[PDB]
């Protein structure tokens, strides 16, 4: 019963196609609640979950001011980074940043996060002590020096221990009926014959929240990790998630195989066989 808030900043340049676009989205656990897009007609930080809508004008104005400013800062940053790698004016490049806090069941800060990537590659990350940086290369050492002089680490600690957890706690209470409700998955096993030799047993999990889940197949009580096929957990569009695990069994041996389902919304962990 622990929770997290994360913010995801994406800045993409597109030379010849206007100034770099800046996108920000806010998540509580696996629930998006705000977005900002500098490409929109009227750029504003916008609600994306009902429980944030009740917030008032000073809220939305602060979140829009900071995001509009970041739109400019992140453009300066994309330019600086192009410099640090001696990159041409012509290529497209991506700066990404994700940050936020983790709190336990009592609301106490478990740890903070701030990580940056450039063109998909780890660039700079705030260390778990919330007061020092890990730079991935000599380009990021420059950013480290700038942030050292700007005392950014202090600012992150104050935010990560302060507003982040306080507002997370405020969000968790205002959306308690969804953010603090775990919906267990609905499950079933299917059977798709392949040849006369073998068939596929597919274990399904549907409608669960949050997305964290464990689907495993056993043959005679022994886990089958090399032999199991897992889809990536996928969103259903209605806040819930879907997943499935498949295993190819010798035909006739289907009952030596069990599927086990671990999920927070489940009273007790599930064991399912194929029921023909």
């Amino acid at each position: 019963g622990s929770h997290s808030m994360r913010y995801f900043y994406t800045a993409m340049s597109r030379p010849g196609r206007g100034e770099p676009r800046f996108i920000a989205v806010g998540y509580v656990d696996d629930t998006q609640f705000v977005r900002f897009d500098s490409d929109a007609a009227s750029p504003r930080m916008a609600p994306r979950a009902p429980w944030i809508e009740q917030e008032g004008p000073e809220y939305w104005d602060r979140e829009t001011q900071i995001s509009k400013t970041n739109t400019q800062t992140y453009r300066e940053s994309l330019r600086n980074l192009r410099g640090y790698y001696n990159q041409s004016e012509a290529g497209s490049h991506t700066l990404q940043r994700m940050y936020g806090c983790d709190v336990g069941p009592d609301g106490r800060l478990l740890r903070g996060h701030d990580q940056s990537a450039y063109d998909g590659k780890d660039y700079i990350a705030l260390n778990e002590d919330l007061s020092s940086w890990t730079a991935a290369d000599t380009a990021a050492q420059i950013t480290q020096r700038k942030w050292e002089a700007a005392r950014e680490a202090e600012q992150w600690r104050a935010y990560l221990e302060g507003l982040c957890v306080e507002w997370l706690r405020r969000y968790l209470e205002n959306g308690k009926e969804t953010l603090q409700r775990a919906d267990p998955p609905k499950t079933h096993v299917t059977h798709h014959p392949i040849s006369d030799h073998e068939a596929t047993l597919r274990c399904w999990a549907l409608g669960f929240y949050p997305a964290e889940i464990t689907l495993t197949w056993q043959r005679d009580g022994e886990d089958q990790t090399q032999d199991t096929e897992l889809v990536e957990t996928r969103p259903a569009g209605d806040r819930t998630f879907q997943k499935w695990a498949a295993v190819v069994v010798p035909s006739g041996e289907e009952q030596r195989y069990t599927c086990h389902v671990q999920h927070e919304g489940l009273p007790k962990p599930l064991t399912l066989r194929w029921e023909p």
């Binding site: 913010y7 920000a24 806010g26 930080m45 809220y59 602060r62 979140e63 900071i66 995001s67 400013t69 970041n70 800062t73 992140y74 300066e76 940053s77 600086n80 980074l81 700066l95 940050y99 940056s116 700079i124 950013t143 700038k146 942030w147 700007a150 950014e152 600012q155 992150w156 935010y159 507003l163 982040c164 507002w167």
Partner: peptide, 9 residues
């Protein structure tokens, strides 16, 4: 709630 804008990279 987002962090206050910070220094460029």
């Amino acid at each position: 709630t987002v962090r206050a804008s910070g220094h460029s990279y």
